[PDB]
């Protein structure tokens, strides 16, 4: 449940640290973004000399949420933060690493690169 104004950690080495969702790229008027949904974001905090810098308007895919996501098998999974991975217009990651676990929902949603770079897929 990410929506405009929501801050997210960036789980990659793109240089970003914190992004604030400014749009949920899901149809005409999606209220929320969950795992696997792409957002548009402003970069609110970056480390010096990165691929992205503070003030960039980037796209990112939500890779884990503090709201638990439910699964057709009757189980759920929840994380301790909202994290996302900065991507390009071809849904490819813009960094070389991703940090922390990601939700397996990314695989079925079409983000095979990120899932591979993930240390754990839960």
């Amino acid at each position: 449940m990410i929506q405009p104004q929501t801050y997210l950690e960036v789980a990659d080495n793109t240089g970003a640290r914190k992004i604030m969702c400014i749009r949920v790229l899901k149809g005409s008027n999606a209220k929320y973004a969950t795992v696997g949904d792409v957002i548009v974001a402003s970069v609110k905090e970056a480390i010096p000399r990165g691929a992205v810098k503070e003030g960039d308007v980037v796209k990112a895919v939500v890779v884990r949420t503090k709201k638990e996501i439910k699964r057709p098998d009757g189980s759920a999974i929840r994380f301790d933060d909202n994290a996302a991975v900065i991507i390009n217009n071809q849904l490819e990651p813009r960094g070389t690493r991703v940090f922390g676990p990601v939700a397996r929902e990314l695989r079925e949603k079409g983000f095979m690169k990120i899932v591979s770079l993930a240390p754990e897929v839960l």
Binding site: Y7, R17, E45
Partner: peptide, 7 residues
């Protein structure tokens, strides 16, 4: 770098 910063 929390958590929002000042700078």
């Amino acid at each position: 770098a929390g958590x929002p910063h000042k700078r």
